[PDB]
Ligand binder design. Structure first.
Ligand SMILES: C[S@@+](CC[C@H](N)C(=O)[O-])C[C@H]1O[C@@H](n2cnc3c(N)ncnc32)[C@H](O)[C@@H]1O
Ligand SMILES: C[S@@+](CC[C@H](N)C(=O)[O-])C[C@H]1O[C@@H](n2cnc3c(N)ncnc32)[C@H](O)[C@@H]1O
Ligand SMILES: Nc1ccn([C@@H]2O[C@H](CO)[C@@H](O)[C@H]2O)c(=O)n1
Ligand SMILES: Nc1ccn([C@@H]2O[C@H](CO)[C@@H](O)[C@H]2O)c(=O)n1
Lengths: 283, 283
């Protein structure tokens, strides 16, 4: 069994007639897993901001299942639209990018394979990486790199980026990667930068914050939160939130699980993953 | 699934040909569960200081299984006796009393049903509760009550106990319970006292400390620690130990799980249980 799949689903404490949210449908792994544990009175409501994820979800032929296209920050609204306030028995969030977003160079997440410098989980709307970098001030880019990338060279990288875009506007991931490599002495030099930019383009951290906030208001008594963070910056947020809300009383923190050596050798990208689980009290 | 059984066993990350220790055999629940996941090359070594537990283990007819009668603090020695140093793939400890110890009034753990004031997990040796209380100084008893019981009234309770034993030596659990109730104003008054005395008679906290210490030396690379604490005083120890030894590098802490509302309503005594999991690194 794995932390990432088996433990995360366990965390939801599924009952057959319960009502669950998969806030990060992706390719339906968790969703299918949850559905297989639901009875005929069970209900699964799924969310994803990525159209391709919606395209997968669309094919699921189950009257108990539905999908919403939008950010999981609007979780509270979705639940209100359906008069489900206080009737959610579990919310699962499997945070970060999907494998298709990573593997399809055209989605523009990769500095390894060339593609449009995009980085949007939802390319239907909002500002792309290229546009953001094309308009942003040096100080802005620097702050993004330091805060979301933990990039020591944020200032010089931001400088080099601004200069480049002043002279020859960047449009492709490989251009960005090459500018970052050049700007830095000498892992790959552009990794943290790409993470920082991605996190900015997608508001990933604030998204998590807002979803966690709304979760308290939508959960039934005994309702579960089962949240997988991909890396430290997300996890910091999940931990802070569970800590603040369980000390005293609206939540009871039920703990935290990380993948062992075997699971990480089996799956490399699980390296920094952290599952956290909590439960809505009666307060 | 439960934290107490399913999650704890998951924590061991069992491979079919691995070598595991169940340090708290009890009635063989975990042991049977582990065995069912072992192949023909697998090995389970079990420990318990309680003869009745040995009497259960004895009936298990499996060449892969063996039982040792002694404190789990001697874990390191047992493993050395068998030339298994560095070859243990997992150690499970399910801490505290067994249900039979609780339910059999004659074992003298209960202030509800009368029995000999004993409280020994291993009645074959060591000093009983009655003997300890019969010889101990007021200040000693007081310290035990405060530290292991978190009993506010430790001083007056210790005083009353000393006086009682000076006049009419206590020999039965109900005598102790009545003395404690009388000594205190007015839950049940004797609960914390009984816990404190039990913990002293059995050295439960130091036992845990020593076993954790030896575990580092016996574990193979990737070897697991899966430890269930029954209450806060044990858990404090497990947490401290995993924290100290994973910051920097001999252990990697893999997290912590607590039972949710449902599991605690299903099982009352799981109320304060905490599962912690770790893994031996290569250091
Ligand atoms: C790590 S994948 C989850 C994969 C899924 N658990 C599975 O088994 O296939 C994360 C998914 O959540 C989506 N996502 C990430 N953040 C989101 C957000 N803030 N709002 C809506 N969807 C989001 C991504 O588009 C991606 O498809
Ligand atoms: C909570 S019961 C474990 C029950 C077991 N997990 C099962 O499934 O049946 C704890 C057992 O561990 C034993 N035990 C507790 N502390 C011990 C110690 N320090 N050394 C050896 N055995 C101990 C007790 O005698 C008791 O039988
Ligand atoms: N609608 C929007 C979207 C993005 N921004 C960008 O936010 C950054 C603030 O550090 C700056 O980089 C700024 O360009 C904005 O100002 N308005
Ligand atoms: N072999 C032993 C066993 C127990 N004790 C008891 O340990 C307590 C120290 O606070 C005191 O209560 C003391 O009686 C001891 O001194 N020697």
């Amino acid at each position: 069994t794995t932390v990432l799949l088996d433990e995360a689903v366990n965390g939801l404490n599924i009952r057959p007639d319960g009502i669950y949210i998969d806030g990060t449908f992706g390719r339906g792994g968790h969703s299918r897993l949850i559905l297989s544990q639901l009875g005929e009175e069970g209900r699964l409501l799924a969310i994803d901001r990525d159209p391709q994820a919606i395209a997968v979800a669309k094919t699921i032929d189950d009257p108990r299942f539905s999908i919403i296209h939008g950010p999981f920050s609007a979780l509270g609204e979705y639940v209100a639209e359906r008069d489900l306030i206080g009737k959610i028995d579990g919310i699962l969030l499997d945070l970060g990018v999907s494998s298709p977003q990573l593997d399809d160079a055209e989605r523009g997440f990769s500095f390894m394979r060339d593609g449009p410098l995009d980085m949007r989980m939802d390319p239907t709307r909002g500002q792309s990486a290229a546009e953001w970098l094309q308009t942003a001030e040096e100080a802005d880019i620097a702050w993004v790199l330091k805060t979301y990338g933990e990039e020591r060279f944020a200032k010089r990288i931001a400088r080099a980026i601004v200069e480049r875009n002043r002279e020859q506007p960047m449009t492709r991931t490989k251009e960005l990667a090459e500018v970052v490599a050049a700007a830095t002495p000498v892992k790959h030099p552009a990794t943290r930068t790409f993470q920082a930019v991605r996190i900015w383009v997608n508001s990933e951290l604030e998204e998590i914050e807002q979803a966690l906030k709304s979760s308290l208001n939508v959960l039934a008594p005994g309702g579960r939160l089962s949240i997988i963070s991909f890396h430290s910056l997300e996890d910091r947020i999940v931990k802070r939130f569970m800590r603040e809300n369980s000390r005293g009383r609206q939540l009871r923190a039920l703990g935290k699980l990380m993948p062992g050596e075997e699971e990480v050798a089996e799956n490399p990208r699980a390296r920094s993953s952290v599952l956290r689980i909590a439960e809505r009290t009666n307060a």
